[PDB]
């Protein structure tokens, strides 16, 4: 009600608006170190 507000609010994405008001898909990569033995990195470059 009055001064009791639902905390979330909608974007309401419209195709008409400008680039600054356009939707954008954001993907955030994260890395730290050392929490386990390392498992992931790039492929080995093997030749003949």
């Amino acid at each position: 009600g009055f001064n009791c507000y639902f905390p979330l609010q909608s974007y309401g994405f419209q195709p008409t608006n400008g680039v600054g008001y356009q939707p954008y898909r954001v993907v955030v990569l994260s890395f730290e170190l050392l929490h386990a033995p390392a498992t992931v990195c790039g492929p080995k470059k093997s030749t003949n």
Partner: antibody
Amino acid sequence: EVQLLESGGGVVQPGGSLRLSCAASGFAFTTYAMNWVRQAPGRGLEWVSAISDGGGSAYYADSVKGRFTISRDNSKNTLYLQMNSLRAEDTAVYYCAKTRGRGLYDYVWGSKDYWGQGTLVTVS
Amino acid sequence: DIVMTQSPLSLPVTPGEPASISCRSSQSLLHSNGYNYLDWYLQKPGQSPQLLIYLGSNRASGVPDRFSGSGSGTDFTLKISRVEAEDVGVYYCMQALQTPGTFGQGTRLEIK
């Protein structure tokens, strides 16, 4: 901006099924609650059913437990009301109407600020 | 549940004259926060009903200023200062406390 559209509801033989579909255009249909209303020609309204967010919580009025089947699609923003065992006293103006309620003590069957456009179901 | 009463139901009121509309409640609708929980509506013929007054006192969106609700506890009253041909409608009342949303029997306002 915000308005509610209905579809279906007409001449039907009693004791069968019917389909009524409620599609929304301009609100956050995931977050808002949803409610169902029956109104006969010549006497005012009667609540029949209500659902909370994401399905799960479905409620029914006294005469309509089991007779009515309710369902919700959060992807295509459509509200359905699957119909079973129609009776001549179910000839009433059927329409979807939305609720405010998003708080903890807002009681999804409660304060319903908008109402839908409206269609008449004739069970005869 | 809440045994609700709207009386009198058929209201022939001359246009330009004030009209007094009441709805009565069995249980007290005053909550622990001090606010009133009963909502006043109007249904036009063929047009979907509107919220006119929420919580007994305040502006619902688009409602003109001459519509005003009153009351406390059980005895509430809806008043219009001036009635015109756009004020014809059937006046309902709904609560928000218990599980079943109880409506009123509908107060038909008529123009003479």
